[PDB]
Nucleic acid binder design. Structure first.
Ligand SMILES: [Mg+2]
Ligand SMILES: [Mg+2]
Ligand SMILES: [Mg+2]
Ligand SMILES: [Mg+2]
Ligand SMILES: [Mg+2]
Ligand SMILES: [Mg+2]
Ligand SMILES: [Mg+2]
Ligand SMILES: [Mg+2]
Ligand SMILES: [Mg+2]
Ligand SMILES: [Mg+2]
Ligand SMILES: [Mg+2]
Ligand SMILES: [Mg+2]
Ligand SMILES: [Mg+2]
Ligand SMILES: [Mg+2]
Ligand SMILES: [Mg+2]
Ligand SMILES: [Mg+2]
Ligand SMILES: [Mg+2]
Ligand SMILES: [Mg+2]
Ligand SMILES: [Mg+2]
Ligand SMILES: [Mg+2]
Ligand SMILES: [Mg+2]
Ligand SMILES: [Mg+2]
Ligand SMILES: [Mg+2]
Ligand SMILES: [Mg+2]
Ligand SMILES: [Mg+2]
Ligand SMILES: [Mg+2]
Ligand SMILES: [Mg+2]
Ligand SMILES: [Mg+2]
Ligand SMILES: [Mg+2]
Ligand SMILES: [Mg+2]
Lengths: 129, 81, 150, 144
RNA sequence: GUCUUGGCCAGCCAUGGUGACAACGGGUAACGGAGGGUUAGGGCUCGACCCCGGAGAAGGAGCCUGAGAAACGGCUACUACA
RNA sequence: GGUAAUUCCAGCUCCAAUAGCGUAUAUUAAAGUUGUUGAGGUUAAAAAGCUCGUAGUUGAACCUUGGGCUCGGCCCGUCGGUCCUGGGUCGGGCCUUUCCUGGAGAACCGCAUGCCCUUCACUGGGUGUGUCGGGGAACCAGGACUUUUACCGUGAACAAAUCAGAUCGCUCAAAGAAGGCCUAUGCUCGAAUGUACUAGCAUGGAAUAAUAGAAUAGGACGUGUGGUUCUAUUUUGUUGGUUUCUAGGACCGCCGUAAUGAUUAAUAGGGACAGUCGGGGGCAUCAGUAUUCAAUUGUCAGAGGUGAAAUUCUUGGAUUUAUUGAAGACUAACUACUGCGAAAGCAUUUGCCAAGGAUGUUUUCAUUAAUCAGGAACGAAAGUUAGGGGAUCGAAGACGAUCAGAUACCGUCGUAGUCUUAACCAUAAACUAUGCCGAUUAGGGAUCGGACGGUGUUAUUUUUUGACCCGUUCGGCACCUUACGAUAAAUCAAAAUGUUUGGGCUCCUGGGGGAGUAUGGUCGCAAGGCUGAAACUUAAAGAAAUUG
RNA sequence: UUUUUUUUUUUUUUUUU
């Protein structure tokens, strides 16, 4: 039984990345997945991702540029306070200037660095570096 | 291979893969017209009919279901729609 | 896989992307609903109705042709079965095993299957009571199964 | 690893499972059951006093051939009988029948230490005088 | 009845209340806390004891005076001790 | 430490701390040996025998996005004014289908003046504002219309002492809250600041996680019209005392308004349909040799059995030969790195009864699902109760050998049992020593079931079907090479995707023994099963490989 | 492919350019 489609997408992405493949097929399609992909794309850790429309959950084909070390999800989505970002970043990321911890806040899917600017917090859902 | 354009696979591959495992699950079935001998009526029959189809008024069996594919009665011509 | 077996077999029907009636259909939505009502009035189950329409009359998908699924058409026309298809076939199957188990007592394999058949009925009827298809006081009882099927 | 629950509302299962599995920990089980207060020869105390009942010799475990000098001591506080090792060369002469001696732990946490089998306590003081003080030329045994 | 509310108690009526989200029962070498010790983070353990709250004055119960006590360096009775 | 003691007892010398040092017990770190972060479960301890299933935990996708107009704060540069400039971030309002009553002051539409302008009306006045009028607003105060929870931000409140921490030369320090300056006359700074997890209070945010909404429309909408019923601010006096219109609340009509109201159908799940598939299950039935016994039959001295013998049978014909009969069990060769079943298990034929997976599907329902503490069904052999049966084999037992003994291995007998109906028992090295669900990841060939496409032989055939051949695909039992990986290793396509550590759920383990023992409970006719310690003891036990 | 039981305690190794 599918329980975390976000984990399925990131696991498939990471498997293709470690194998050296330049692209990966992702099923199914979710609003969280697309927003999570766009966070990758803004920092350039991926390239083009294309969504195939269907009369069901869609598919995504992501073109990988090879500059992607590790992407993973967090289960459950712990409720994080503003004072807890630094502990979460330290215990989970490499050196604190490359990776980006992904949260879901009332402002939407967005980074841990962006949270410090906007002074908001929420639930941790993933990470990359 | 490390480099495949998964968006636009070969049409030969599409005819090769499973009907669900393709990029978009297009059904492999079709609708087809049966011409019965001795009469001039056209009846639409599913390619994978599960019932013994008899023509409308001709009282003649047109196909027998078996193994997930209809076997047309001998002496009838067909044309895929 | 299967809910009551190892059974990891994938087999289904792939609905085409069209969502539009094909150009070779010249039948009115009024006509097909008349076909649906006539078949249902005779006694055909909504699963059986789709088969005969698809195989003989060339209706690939009733929803595509009309816009409503067969059961919602039947309820609108007041011809929906009192008991849902899913329970009726499951209860009828359980009744069949009982008559075999009464005669044959050493069939411990049939005894085990009856438990699985009964377990599906209870799980199913629990869902129907949740959505409101069946009264909350509806209960499947061993000796009363034959009465419901009749 | 283990198939531990990972839901956001599974704290009850996580705490209950930890409480059950913590009993297998030997040191927590000893403290939680309070076995020192129940079964230990002492009442959980570091030391205890008793009356010397007799002097016994204990053969050393292999590979070691010697007679470890010990005394059977009946504790005053509860009446339990234990065997106490008498350390240092020739200190068994200071101990005598019906003396009042103070006993302590012998090594680590009630387990017998060294090649002395079944001896888990040692003599510290005799007649209110330290055994080392008697063994050295520092103090004198009470006149009595 | 109480300073007052209250099954607090007396009468009449009804059959309810709690529980697997651990009720009820048992153990604590359990007074509670602010806090002590030791820890990168997450924690483990102790807290009779200089402060705040509670209870007790050999063990129970009852009561007078009094704004204030079920008081004990107050009284009355019983048990133990003397 | 066994007559050369770097370890005992001493002398000398040296080392560590030093007015202190050692010892015993409790606790913490080390301990990723309690693991939420963050352990382990093939072989080192540990996946329940298997399936169903309640509580619990978890649970497919989907509903306002995009663009533009701008305005402002902060940051990153040169301009340094005294000894104004682009980009980035954040925030504010508008367009792009996106609260009234009294407004006390606000304000748009023109303002009483005022402002610039095409040459198109001259001007010296007037702060606070009255009216026409008020799309959008902070102000008070009455009311109406807000899906509700979780979560995050901010704010208020939140004993001292303790802790962190600021200041001051108690002679420094632990401390303490002091002190300092002027010669004086008396003058002055201080005695800070942070800390309130979780629960409670107020407001904002609206992603994420839940829940409702219109389907037998009993749905929404009025400056729409009509009723029933209830209440009462005001006018010529009357909450008392009623007697019209009228202003509010509830319910129900007719008419109109509206794009009138239902998300997909998951390589999730259930159900249906079609041809197959199977040593899946039950009942009855049939056949087959063989074994034992018996009857008849011909022969004469041995036959069994073993490493070698002996017990044993034998001129009463043993063993052997042929024919026949009876009994009970079993189903050989075919039989496989093959099949079915949840597992235990399942192999002669036929008929009946009910069931099952895979396949194919443009059939149906629409989240109905996953795993499961307690709970329940099935569960080899052995064993138990009551009948039937009892051929073979064979616990116990009796002998004959061997041997020092032989209560064993070997041989001859032989009871229970082995077989069956009814009822128990519930354990196996019940093993793939490897829990169930889901996704992804290197190649290859066989094989089983189904389906599809092609080709040529073969049997039938008013040209269909079966066998064989090649290929594709779904689903299985497995296998072969490799390591981008894993492990301590053996080895593993899972034991991989894990110190770059989080997909969901359940169970079990914490050095070796004592011990799966004692006790209590519960189930059983009993044997026993399930649950399940502690005292005490010990420095190893153990896993995989290496050389002998 | 006749059989072949047992072996008293302890004792069995270290450093650098
Ligand atoms: Mg599947
Ligand atoms: Mg299940
Ligand atoms: Mg159920
Ligand atoms: Mg959760
Ligand atoms: Mg040793
Ligand atoms: Mg106490
Ligand atoms: Mg005390
Ligand atoms: Mg009194
Ligand atoms: Mg461990
Ligand atoms: Mg072992
Ligand atoms: Mg093991
Ligand atoms: Mg298993
Ligand atoms: Mg749920
Ligand atoms: Mg059969
Ligand atoms: Mg003869
Ligand atoms: Mg077979
Ligand atoms: Mg056979
Ligand atoms: Mg079938
Ligand atoms: Mg077992
Ligand atoms: Mg096992
Ligand atoms: Mg898998
Ligand atoms: Mg295959
Ligand atoms: Mg095949
Ligand atoms: Mg198979
Ligand atoms: Mg341990
Ligand atoms: Mg252990
Ligand atoms: Mg070994
Ligand atoms: Mg030997
Ligand atoms: Mg001997
Ligand atoms: Mg021996």
């Amino acid at each position: 039984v599918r329980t975390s489609v976000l984990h399925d997408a990131l696991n498939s992405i990471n498997n293709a990345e470690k194998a050296g493949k330049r692209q990966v097929l992702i099923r199914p399609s979710s609003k969280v997945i697309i927003k999570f992909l766009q966070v990758m794309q803004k920092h350039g850790y991926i390239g083009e991702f294309e969504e195939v429309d269907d009369h069901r959950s869609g598919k995504i084909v992501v073109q990988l540029n090879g500059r992607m070390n590790k992407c993973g999800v967090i289960s459950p989505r712990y409720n994080v306070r503003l004072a807890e970002l630094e502990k979460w970043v330290v215990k989970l990321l490499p050196a604190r200037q490359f990776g980006y911890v992904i949260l879901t806040t009332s402002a939407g899917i967005m980074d841990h660095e962006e949270a410090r600017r906007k002074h908001v917090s929420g639930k941790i859902i993933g990470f990359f570096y | 291979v490390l480099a495949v354009d998964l968006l636009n696979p070969s049409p030969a591959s599409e005819a090769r893969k499973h009907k669900l495992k393709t990029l978009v699950p297009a059904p492999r079935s079709f609708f087809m017209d049966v011409k019965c001998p001795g009469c001039f009526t056209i009846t639409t029959v599913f390619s994978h009919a599960q019932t013994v189809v008899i023509c409308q008024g001709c009282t003649t069996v047109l196909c027998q279901p078996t193994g997930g594919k209809a076997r047309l009665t001998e002496g009838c011509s067909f044309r895929r729609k | 896989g299967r809910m009551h077996s190892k059974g990891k077999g994938i087999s289904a029907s792939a609905i085409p992307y069209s969502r539009n009636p094909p150009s070779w259909l010249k039948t009115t939505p009024e006509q097909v609903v008349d076909q649906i009502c006539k078949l249902a009035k005779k006694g055909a189950t909504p699963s059986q109705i789709g088969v005969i329409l698809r195989d003989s009359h060339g209706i690939a998908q009733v929803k595509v042709v009309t816009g409503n699924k067969i059961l919602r058409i039947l309820k609108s026309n007041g011809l929906a079965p009192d008991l849902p298809e899913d329970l009726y076939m499951l209860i009828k199957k359980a009744v069949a095993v009982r008559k075999h188990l009464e005669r044959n007592r050493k069939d411990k394999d049939s005894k085990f299957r009856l438990i699985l058949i009964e377990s599906r009925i209870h799980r199913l009827a629990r869902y129907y009571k949740t959505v409101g298809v069946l009264p909350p006081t509806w209960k499947y009882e061993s000796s009363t199964a034959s009465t419901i099927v009749s | 690893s283990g198939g531990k629950p990972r839901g956001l509302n599974a704290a009850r299962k996580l705490r209950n499972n930890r409480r059950e599995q913590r009993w297998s920990d030997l040191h927590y089980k000893k403290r939680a059951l309070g076995t020192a207060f129940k079964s230990s020869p002492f009442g959980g105390s570091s030391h205890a006093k008793g009356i010397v009942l007799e002097k016994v010799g204990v053969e050393a475990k292999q590979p070691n051939s010697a007679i470890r000098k010990c005394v059977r001591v009946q504790l005053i506080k509860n009446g339990k009988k234990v065997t106490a090792f008498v350390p240092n060369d020739g200190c068994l002469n200071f101990v005598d029948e019906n003396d009042e001696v103070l006993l302590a732990g012998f090594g680590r946490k009630g387990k017998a230490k060294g090649d002395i089998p079944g001896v888990r306590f040692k003599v510290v003081k005799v007649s209110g005088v330290g055994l080392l003080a008697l063994w050295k030329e520092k103090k004198e045994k009470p006149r009595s």
